[PDB]
Amino acid sequence: SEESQAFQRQLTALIGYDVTDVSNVHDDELEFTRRGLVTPRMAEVASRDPKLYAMHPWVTSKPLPEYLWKKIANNCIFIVIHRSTTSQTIKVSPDDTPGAILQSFFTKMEQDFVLRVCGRDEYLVGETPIKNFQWVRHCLKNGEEIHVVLDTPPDPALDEVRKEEWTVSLWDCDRKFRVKIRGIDIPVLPDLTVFVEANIQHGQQVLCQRRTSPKPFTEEVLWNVWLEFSIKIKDLPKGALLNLQIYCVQLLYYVNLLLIDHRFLLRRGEYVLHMWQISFNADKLTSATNPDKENSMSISILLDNAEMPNQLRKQLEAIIATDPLNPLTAEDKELLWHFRYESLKHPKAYPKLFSSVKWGQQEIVAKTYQLLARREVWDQSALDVGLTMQLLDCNFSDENVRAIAVQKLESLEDDDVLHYLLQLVQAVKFEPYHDSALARFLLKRGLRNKRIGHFLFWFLRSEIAQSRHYQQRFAVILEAYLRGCGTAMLHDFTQQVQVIEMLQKVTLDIKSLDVSSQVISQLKQKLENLQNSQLPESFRVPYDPGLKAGALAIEKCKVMASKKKPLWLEFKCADPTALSNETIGIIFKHGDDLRQDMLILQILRIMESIWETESLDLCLLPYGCISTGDKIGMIEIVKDATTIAKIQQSTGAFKDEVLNHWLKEKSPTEEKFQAAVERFVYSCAGYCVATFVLGIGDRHNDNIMITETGNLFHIDFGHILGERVPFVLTPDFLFVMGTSGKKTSPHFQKFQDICVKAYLALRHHTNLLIILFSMMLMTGMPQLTSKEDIEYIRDALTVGKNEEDAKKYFLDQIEVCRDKGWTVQFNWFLHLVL
Numbered sequence: 001s002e003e004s005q006a007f008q009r010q011l012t013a014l015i016g017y018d019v020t021d022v023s024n025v026h027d028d029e030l031e032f033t034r035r036g037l038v039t040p041r042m043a044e045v046a047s048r049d050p051k052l053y054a055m056h057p058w059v060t061s062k063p064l065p066e067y068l069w070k071k072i073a074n075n076c077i078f079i080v081i082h083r084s085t086t087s088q089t090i091k092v093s094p095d096d097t098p099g100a101i102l103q104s105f106f107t108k109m110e111q112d113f114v115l116r117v118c119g120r121d122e123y124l125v126g127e128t129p130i131k132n133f134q135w136v137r138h139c140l141k142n143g144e145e146i147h148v149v150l151d152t153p154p155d156p157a158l159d160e161v162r163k164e165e166w167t168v169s170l171w172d173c174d175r176k177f178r179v180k181i182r183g184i185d186i187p188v189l190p191d192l193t194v195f196v197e198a199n200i201q202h203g204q205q206v207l208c209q210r211r212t213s214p215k216p217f218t219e220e221v222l223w224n225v226w227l228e229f230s231i232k233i234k235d236l237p238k239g240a241l242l243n244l245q246i247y248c249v250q251l252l253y254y255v256n257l258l259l260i261d262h263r264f265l266l267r268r269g270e271y272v273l274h275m276w277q278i279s280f281n282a283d284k285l286t287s288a289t290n291p292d293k294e295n296s297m298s299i300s301i302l303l304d305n306a307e308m309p310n311q312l313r314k315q316l317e318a319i320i321a322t323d324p325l326n327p328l329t330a331e332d333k334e335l336l337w338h339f340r341y342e343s344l345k346h347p348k349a350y351p352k353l354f355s356s357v358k359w360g361q362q363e364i365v366a367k368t369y370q371l372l373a374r375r376e377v378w379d380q381s382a383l384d385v386g387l388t389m390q391l392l393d394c395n396f397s398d399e400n401v402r403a404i405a406v407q408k409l410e411s412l413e414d415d416d417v418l419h420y421l422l423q424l425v426q427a428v429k430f431e432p433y434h435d436s437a438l439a440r441f442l443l444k445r446g447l448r449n450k451r452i453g454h455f456l457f458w459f460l461r462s463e464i465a466q467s468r469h470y471q472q473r474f475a476v477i478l479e480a481y482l483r484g485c486g487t488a489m490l491h492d493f494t495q496q497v498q499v500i501e502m503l504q505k506v507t508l509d510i511k512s513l514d515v516s517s518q519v520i521s522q523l524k525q526k527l528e529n530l531q532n533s534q535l536p537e538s539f540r541v542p543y544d545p546g547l548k549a550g551a552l553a554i555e556k557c558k559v560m561a562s563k564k565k566p567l568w569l570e571f572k573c574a575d576p577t578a579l580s581n582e583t584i585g586i587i588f589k590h591g592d593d594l595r596q597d598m599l600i601l602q603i604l605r606i607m608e609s610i611w612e613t614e615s616l617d618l619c620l621l622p623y624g625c626i627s628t629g630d631k632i633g634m635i636e637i638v639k640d641a642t643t644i645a646k647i648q649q650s651t652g653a654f655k656d657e658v659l660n661h662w663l664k665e666k667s668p669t670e671e672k673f674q675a676a677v678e679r680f681v682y683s684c685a686g687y688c689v690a691t692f693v694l695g696i697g698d699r700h701n702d703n704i705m706i707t708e709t710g711n712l713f714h715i716d717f718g719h720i721l722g723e724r725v726p727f728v729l730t731p732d733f734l735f736v737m738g739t740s741g742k743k744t745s746p747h748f749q750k751f752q753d754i755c756v757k758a759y760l761a762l763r764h765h766t767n768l769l770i771i772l773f774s775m776m777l778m779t780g781m782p783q784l785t786s787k788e789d790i791e792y793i794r795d796a797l798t799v800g801k802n803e804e805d806a807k808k809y810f811l812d813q814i815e816v817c818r819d820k821g822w823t824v825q826f827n828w829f830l831h832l833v834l
């Protein structure tokens with residue numbers, strides 16, 4: 001009880017927000033959730049395997065791609081086992097496991113040791129086939145030797161968890177719901193007339209709307225009006241958001257209040273809600289009141305209480321085939337609902353079905369629940385992630401509807417959970433209530449696997465550190481996680497948090513003071529002062545928790561000559577068993593919002609996985625990136641890489657030959673050089689298709705880079721998000737491919753061919769990409785997120801069009817880029833002057 005004060009204070013340090021704080025609330029939902037999440041934590045902690053949790057092996061049940069089979073020699077796998085600076089090689093089959101492989105070593109010169117990967121904290125352990133380990137595939141994909149160091153396993157005791165110590169409406173009537181608007185109050189006015197618009201909302205649909213009369217916008221406006229709504233109290237659905245907004249027209253302020261609380265009670269009493277200052281985005285839905293009580297506006301209220309016909313089946317099937325953004329007419333909705341039992345047979349009909357429910361009626365919602373009660377077809381259906389994701393977006397409130405979504409995610413293996421985790425963390429923003437099946441899914445999955453747990457922490461910490469709209473909720477979830485992750489990890493997270501808090505301090509202090517002599521001088525002094533006392537011996541790399549970064553390579557650290565002034569920092573590896581002498585690189589940056597970088601890079605990983613399922617590898621580089629705080633964070637330095645603008649600038653006269661010449665120098669042999677040119681054709685093709693689909697194609701060439709081995713890759717997506725070519729394919733790139741102006745070439749034929757395959761590949765997962773894009777814009781990018789902005793990707797994916805018309809579309813977009821040529825790239829420098 002005296003010791004728990006320090007532990008709670010330790011948890012507040014890791015979260016960067018006090019969950020015991022009660023200044024910004026009008027109920028106990030957050031405290032109820034803190035208590036509510038105890039059971040799921042303690043359940044999952046009680047059921048987890050200690051040794052497997054300790055070693056967390058990164059394995060899969062998905063097949064090896066048709067591309068990766070060619071790198072197997074003679075059904076053989078060369079593992080290089082190390083032990084005390086003395087190595088040995090072993091012949092291994094693809095279906096072998098570590099236990100069989102260890103017994104082979106002991107024969108050639110028992111069950112105490114474990115086979116750990118060289119460089120990383122990663123363990124080839126368990127009863128998984130050696131073909132289906134992620135690390136075995138990294139070494140096959142990159143073309144590397146599978147190196148592993150024999151040593152003792154990590155002791156489970158280190159991962160000990162601390163001991164802990166702790167339907168319908170009530171007041172139900174056929175009365176019409178009403179709220180008295182007493183008045184509003186702000187200390188300073190920021191536009192002479194104003195009025196309150198009150199809205200009964202369920203899942204971003206206005207069930208009923210009433211307004212006050214207009215009045216002069218003075219510092220204290222008092223209407224004292226009862227607004228009677230049409231909707232009856234018994235007809236209020238759970239999760240019904242009372243949304244209050246101030247207009248002048250122009251929406252200036254907004255706040256929300258849940259009409260039915262976490263204990264199923266109707267909301268009643270005097271409330272003084274502090275509002276947010278200002279098209280739909282996730283912030284607009286929040287149950288959170290404004291914490292800035294001094295400067296913010298406040299509203300004050302009072303609550304006192306047979307077989308189907310042929311044509312129609314075909315008509316219904318037509319509705320079910322359409323894209324997620326395809327509008328349902330009131331005719332369509334009436335059809336879907338009337339034949340809801342037929343609609344229930346088709347899992348793909350579900351989003352549209354539950355979008356056809358009149359959530360303003362108790363009889364209907366009752367019927368909808370009776371319908372969901374018999375879901376044999378839903379449970380037996382093969383997991384569709386895109387379908388599951390629809391049902392967790394802003395259009396669906398209602399626990400049961402969202403619950404069957406989460407029910408399908410349960411089947412995802414750990415590998416697939418990481419792929420979708422960020423989006424799923426963001427989807428918590430669309431939850432009406434703090435405690436939710438989704439929140440509990442995340443917590444559970446985080447506690448079961450350290451890798452998922454690691455990235456959960458940081459994704460949660462990102463939003464806690466900068467979203468006032470949702471910091472309160474996410475913190476109660478992260479506190480819940482950290483209370484079961486283990487003492488080993490809590491110490492590990494603390495190390496990382498303390499390293500980051502140092503390194504951001506140097507970044508911002510140097511940002512205050514193009515490059516000069518004193519800036520180069522002061523940095524090398526600043527990094528020495530931290531390394532000599534403050535900074536640890538070693539710490540986990542947040543963007544990659546296999547790597548333990550050691551000391552600073554102070555020689556290699558430097559500041560960019562840019563307005564934003566990022567810190568390029570470089571670390572030696574703390575692991576002595578690491579194969580090379582190569583450094584772990586990091587870019588700390590203030591000024592950009594790196595949550596936009598996060599979300600784009602995460603879709604690129606999803607695009608790779610899609611491409612893997614249809615045996616394609618377009619050679620993307622989705623480097624590590626983690627947002628740590630407000631306009632601040634961290635990026636993985638991609639090694640042996642330059643910007644294509646530096647290659648050129650060595651005014652604004654761009655040159656066709658130079659990139660091709662640049663590859664000839666950094667690659668010694670021709671067969672390497674051609675291998676670079678090959679890698680360029682894929683990488684360039686993949687980044688063209690991906691950026692077209694995401695609407696972020698038109699980049700200026702400072703924000704496009706290439707590796708010495710010809711791997712093209714884009715950067716700085718946060719910069720862009722906030723005459724026009726569809727994607728960067730400047731002449732310099734085409735010159736590597738052996739074509740100039742009108743001409744064609746054998747690599748350029750291969751470019752168009754892959755681009756077409758990839759594009760059509762992504763189009764086989766249209767719905768998934770539509771929702772990822774939809775949810776990105778709503779949760780990630782406040783700047784632009786209207787109906788038309790979401791509907792960009794429809795036109796990009798050529799929805800409702802066959803593979804021939806679609807092929808023609810993308811090839812024409814390639815022809816545009818050439819027809820304009822250097823035009824746009826030159827126009828950036830021209831715009832700096834103009």
Ligand SMILES: C[C@@H](c1oc(=O)c2ccccc2c1-c1ccccc1)n1nc(-c2cc(O)cc(F)c2)c2c(N)ncnc21
Pocket residue numbers: 558559560561566567568587589592597623625635636637638639641642643646702715716717
């Ligand atoms: C532009 C370049 C760069 O960025 C610095 O910060 C920097 C700092 C001190 C000196 C040179 C630099 C350079 C640099 C410029 C020209 C040639 C070589 C290096 N850059 N930028 C990102 C990068 C990517 C993001 O998504 C977000 C972000 F904020 C930065 C990046 C990366 N991930 N990997 C490798 N290089 C990278």
